[PDB]
């Protein structure tokens with residue numbers, strides 16, 4: 001069974017700029033674009049995880065998407081952390097890809113929120129965080145996450161604590177993790193790199209993010225601060241992509257360079 005849901009997709013306008021600003025200064029995103037939207041959603045969820053239920057949907061352009069709804073209410077600012085994290089990863093990955101150090105390209109799945117609405121008057125408008133909370137609360141529902149459907153053989157490549165999948169090693173992913181820390185000047189590290197690999201393309205989902213600032217990604221269970229960053233680097237070996245990029249090493253690195261895998 002499936003029915004129509006109408007409402008608003010909420011994204012961040014000018015994401016590149018806002019992320020670049022969020023990263024350089026210390027100031028949260030305070031700008032959210034609403035776009036009226038209508039999908040067909042299944043009634044029965046086809047999967048659950050620890051925290052939420054997963055429904056198949058079609059978005060109107062005909063794309064296969066997944067709608068995710070949480071088991072019980074979570075406040076907006078928590079859901080927003082997942083979105084802010086995803087937009088950091090996409091922003092980092094786009095830059096990294098553009099370096100053209102590797103024939104493999106990284107794509108984190110887009111995440112946005114959706115809220116059901118009888119009305120379309122916020123369509124095309126940018127709202128503040130407070131205004132977004134009021135539009136969510138007018139609904140009295142926790143918003144859903146929406147992301148493109150991903151099929152294929154799913155693999156966890158690097159966890160958020162120094163573990164490495166050895167038989168599915170790709171040097172592009174390890175150099176990416178290392179580089180995220182270089183590009184953000186030691187502030188953060190992207191790991192929990194996992195998803196699907198097809199035709200030189202990694203479709204990646206649910207990454208973790210370690211931040212040196214305790215006050216920064218406060219809800220994430222997978223953020224392990226400076227300790228997480230150290231854990232990654234203890235087992236990290238700079239590979240031919242790290243070398244090609246001249247990545248300076250974290251001081252916790254002890255192991256010698258390796259030259260297996262890409263390039």
Ligand SMILES: Nc1ncnc2c1ncn2[C@@H]1O[C@H](COP(=O)(O)OP(=O)(O)O)[C@@H](O)[C@H]1O
Pocket residue numbers: 047048049050051052053054066068147148149150151
């Ligand atoms: N394309 C997709 N995007 C998101 N989730 C998907 C997708 N395809 C399948 N799923 C299913 O969603 C399940 C649970 O979703 P997940 O996001 O992990 O929920 P939880 O956050 O509670 O762990 C996954 O194990 C998988 O079975």
Ligand SMILES: [Zn+2]
Pocket residue numbers: 174175178236237238239242247
């Ligand atoms: Zn390295």
